[PDB]
């Protein structure tokens, strides 16, 4: 699909609540200024956070939620220009636009939205926000924002919980809420969930499809994510060998505790690599099985790089076929098994044993 | 000259951290709410008739009403289908709803606005459950053109006038710029069933100087 002629959307994060300010009378052509202004929201929930008085400049102002009919279903919508219209932060198709050009200001960039007229105004928030779950408790109503205003200022350790009739696209909705105002925060609160988050995680695979689609415009972000299992049933286990002075820890605290020795060592942690292993899809990907996906990794004013396989010289597709090959006389069959059968013996070991020779890439 | 934009990248990092700040600003307790301010204007507002009120005990039906029935003979002169026969109950008792419980009291007023919200529940379904007996008890006093609309009335003045003394006596509690939102939901599924009783009160209606009662409808009728 696309946007319609004549349709633009702002996104920003500040946006969760309403930009009354913003927004200005629109006219045709010939100054036929429209100060009939339509409003749709998800939610009167949303109405009941709006203020008519912000909006003197209009004397006709009205607002409704937006109910997605059947019959004027179009890839070109309805058209009224009689009254100005705007949409705020809506979740499906729309089948009618106001007055001039309309506008939508929105947090999420729906696949509805792919292919639009479109704004960001995006900048940098720094704060990574965090989860933990011990399983005192702040207790959420887990949808109503401004019932917690100042709560989550003021706490940093927040329980997460629904009603089994919601819509996929609203507990989508309220959760992106989140995360901004989180980011906004001066420190990492802990979300705790009350739910078995399999789907969950699959809306998270989501996310990044939608992060990725900002990507498109978007501020490139250092976001912090991650595999919530996979990733974490491994992390726990890998930190239970190791001591584990504070089950807490912060995975990015090993991550560059690890980052310390990689030029010395020039070479990349098996930790790295099982992430990028491990992940459904960006990674070697059990998806469809994709090593191949290995790890070209450069550092400043280096003449080469490390690969998930050595080092490799600059741009180049990890090994030409012309080689110092692994000619046959070594690694024959023959002086493998041999050689095997002297191991064997003196090991006097029955059972488990293989071999196998080095190879080698455009380095030896 | 610089003309990349990463100045006014910088300016809008430092303009960032304002943000939370103005918007707690924006979502403070506010002053007193224009709908209580016009209810008490109103209230004692015109030619005494909020002070003729004296009805009381508010789960009783034609306490001696004949009397004021008597001016409301005269009364019968003026268009009273203007008046609405229904009652717009959710939204007259909207502007209760702006009461963060947890400050400006110590958290008990919440019980007493709900047994008042059930005591006006229980009114109005009585209230609709003998309508008609009403009707033959208020005919008694002689027929009108709009005995309907002025049983309607009889019924919202004489609740009116207690509301009045409900709101004098919770007075002060500090209007939020929100409705409190569990105590919203509560009204609204209680507006739901009262608008399921206006339903089952299928009926047929019998059919200027009104600068003051005309304050007093368009009250009635929520009209800001």
Not at chain 1, 136 to 164: G, M, T, W, Y
């Amino acid at each position: 699909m696309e946007c319609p002629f004549q349709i633009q959307v702002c996104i920003s994060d500040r946006f969760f609540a309403f930009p009354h300010n913003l927004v200005e009378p629109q006219s045709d052509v010939g100054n036929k200024l429209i100060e009939n202004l339509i409003v749709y929201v998800p939610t009167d929930d949303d109405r009941l956070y709006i203020d008519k008085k912000q909006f003197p400049k209009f004397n006709s102002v009205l607002v409704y939620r937006h109910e997605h009919d059947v019959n004027i279903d179009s890839r070109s919508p309805k058209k009224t220009a009689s009254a100005t219209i705007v949409y705020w932060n809506p979740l499906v198709p729309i089948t009618e636009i106001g007055a001039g050009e309309t506008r939508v200001f929105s947090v999420l960039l729906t696949n509805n939205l792919f292919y639009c007229n479109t704004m960001i105004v995006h900048h940098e928030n720094p704060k990574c926000p965090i989860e933990f779950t011990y399983p005192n408790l702040r207790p959420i109503a887990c949808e109503i924002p401004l019932s917690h205003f100042k709560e989550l200022v003021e706490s940093n350790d927040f329980l997460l919980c629904f009603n089994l009739e919601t819509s996929t696209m609203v507990k989508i909705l309220s959760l992106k809420r989140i995360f901004c105002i989180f980011q906004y925060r001066k420190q990492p609160a802990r979300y705790v969930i009350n739910l078995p988050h399999e789907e969950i995680d699959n809306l998270y695979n989501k996310l990044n499809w939608e992060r990725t689609r900002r990507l498109m415009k978007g501020d490139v972000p250092s976001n912090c994510a991650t595999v919530n299992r996979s990733s974490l049933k491994y992390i726990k286990q890998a930190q239970s060998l190791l001591g584990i002075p504070d089950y807490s820890q912060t995975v990015v605290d090993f991550v560059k505790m690890f980052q310390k020795i990689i030029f010395p060592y020039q070479l990349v942690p098996n930790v790295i690599i099982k992430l990028n292993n491990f992940d459904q899809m960006v990674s070697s990907a059990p998806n469809k099985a994709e090593p191949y996906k290995k790890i070209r990794l450069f550092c400043k004013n280096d003449s080469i790089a490390i690969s998930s396989s050595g080092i490799v010289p600059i741009n180049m597709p990890d090994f030409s076929p012309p080689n110092t090959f692994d000619y046959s006389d070594y690694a024959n069959r023959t002086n493998i098994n041999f050689v095997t059968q002297r191991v064997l013996t003196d090991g006097g070991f029955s059972s488990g044993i293989t071999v196998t020779p080095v190879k080698y890439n455009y380095y030896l | 000259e610089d003309v990349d934009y990463e100045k006014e990248s910088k300016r809008r990092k430092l303009e960032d951290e304002d943000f939370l700040k103005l918007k707690a600003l924006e979502f403070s307790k506010d002053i007193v709410n224009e709908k209580l301010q016009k209810i008490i204007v109103v209230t004692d507002g015109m030619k005494r008739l909020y002070e003729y009120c004296n009805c009381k005990n508010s789960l009783e039906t034609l306490p001696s009403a004949a009397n004021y029935g008597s001016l409301l003979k005269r009364l019968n002169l003026y268009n009273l289908d203007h008046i609405e026969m229904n009652v717009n109950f959710y939204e007259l008792l909207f502007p209760l709803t702006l009461y963060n419980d947890n400050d400006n009291s110590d958290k008990t007023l919440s019980h007493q606005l709900v047994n008042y919200i059930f005591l006006a529940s229980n009114y109005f379904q009585n209230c609709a459950k003998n309508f008609n007996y009403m009707r033959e008890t208020f005919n008694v006093f002689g027929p009108f053109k709009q005995i309907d609309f002025m049983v309607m009335f009889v019924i919202k003045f004489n609740f009116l006038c207690d509301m009045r003394n409900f709101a004098k006596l919770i007075d002060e509690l500090v209007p939020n710029k929100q409705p409190n939102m569990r105590i919203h939901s509560v009204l609204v599924m209680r507006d739901k069933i009262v608008k399921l009783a206006f339903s089952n009160l299928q009926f047929q209606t019998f059919s200027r100087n009104t600068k003051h009662l005309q304050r007093l409808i368009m009250l009635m009728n929520a009209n800001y």
